């Protein structure tokens, strides 16, 4: 009932400002032909009321996936997006959000032999958006499991703290794969939500209402 107090210019406030303003910049508003003044201001406000909140949705999916992907790089933790229903359940949910937005642009009625081939390549976007997140979080962690088993075979067989140039070259190969996994954790949360702005932004187009009557000169 009493909210907390926030310092202005905090680092999480500055990061989330730049993150939100990034994903909002991916689907920018289009400039009308008219000058924007008090005549055009309800047409601009109504143009914003009909645009989807992709600036908010894409930073919802950025912040929920980069938090899940980076859990996999914390010790004792696995990434939730390394699960099939989690990661592909976010991919179908973006694809259905784009489709529900594109179906409402009409009156919820669904759109010769061409259109089953536009549909297939469009329905594959559903599974491809989630499986790309799932396989990247799975295939990076699986390779790390195999190579840690190989790099444990040498000190198990040879001496503990002995024959160390054999295990140094593979502990530095294991260390450079966890480092690549920090890059794939940040990239795949970016690629998921760059693509969410692209798919949802396809149906983010409505008619500018504008002035129907003018007093020229």
């Amino acid at each position: 009932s009493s909210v907390r107090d926030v310092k202005t210019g905090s680092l999480p406030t500055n990061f989330l400002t730049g993150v939100y303003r990034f994903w909002r910049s991916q689907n920018p508003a289009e400039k009308p032909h008219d000058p924007v003044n008090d005549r055009l201001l309800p047409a601009v406000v109504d143009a914003s009321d009909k645009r989807a909140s992709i600036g908010t949705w894409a930073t919802t999916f950025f912040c929920t996936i980069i938090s899940c992907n980076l859990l996999g790089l914390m010790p004792f933790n696995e990434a939730p997006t390394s699960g099939l229903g989690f990661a592909t359940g976010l991919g179908v949910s973006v694809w259905a959000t784009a489709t529900i937005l594109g179906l409402s642009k009409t009156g919820f009625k669904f759109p010769f032999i061409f259109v089953p081939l536009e549909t297939i390549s469009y329905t594959f976007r559903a599974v491809s958006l989630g499986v790309r997140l799932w396989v990247n979080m799975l295939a990076g962690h699986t390779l790390l499991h195999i190579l840690t088993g190989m790099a444990l075979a040498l000190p198990f067989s040879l001496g503990f703290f002995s024959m160390v140039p054999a295990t140094f070259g593979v502990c530095c190969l294991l260390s450079a794969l966890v480092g690549l996994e920090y890059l794939v954790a940040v990239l795949q949360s970016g690629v998921f939500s760059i693509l969410s702005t692209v798919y949802v932004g396809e149906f983010n187009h409505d008619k500018f209402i504008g002035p129907a009557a003018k007093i020229v000169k």
């Binding site: 926030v6 202005t8 210019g9 406030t13 989330l16 400002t17 939100y20 908010t56 949705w57 930073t59 919802t60 999916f61 912040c63 929920t64 899940c68 939730p80 699960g83 099939l84 229903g85 989690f86 990661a87 359940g89 976010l90 179908v92 949910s93 699986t142």
Partner: protein, 62 residues
């Protein structure tokens, strides 16, 4: 290895609960705070030329 979960609907609903909490938390807690300090700065930087000229025309002190 582990490919399919024990329930796919339980993992899909965990994703929808996590991503709808992040949607609620952003819309309700983060973005009001973002915009309170983004738009104090932005309104002051956009009005600064017309605020000061309106105030120059108003105060009789010159």
């Amino acid at each position: 290895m582990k490919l399919l979960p024990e329930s796919l609907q339980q993992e899909a609903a965990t994703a929808a609960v996590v991503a709808s909490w992040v949607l609620w938390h952003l819309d309700t807690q983060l973005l009001p705070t973002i915009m309170r300090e983004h738009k104090l700065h932005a309104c002051w930087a956009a009005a600064a030329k017309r605020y000061n000229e309106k105030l120059f025309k108003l105060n009789p002190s010159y």
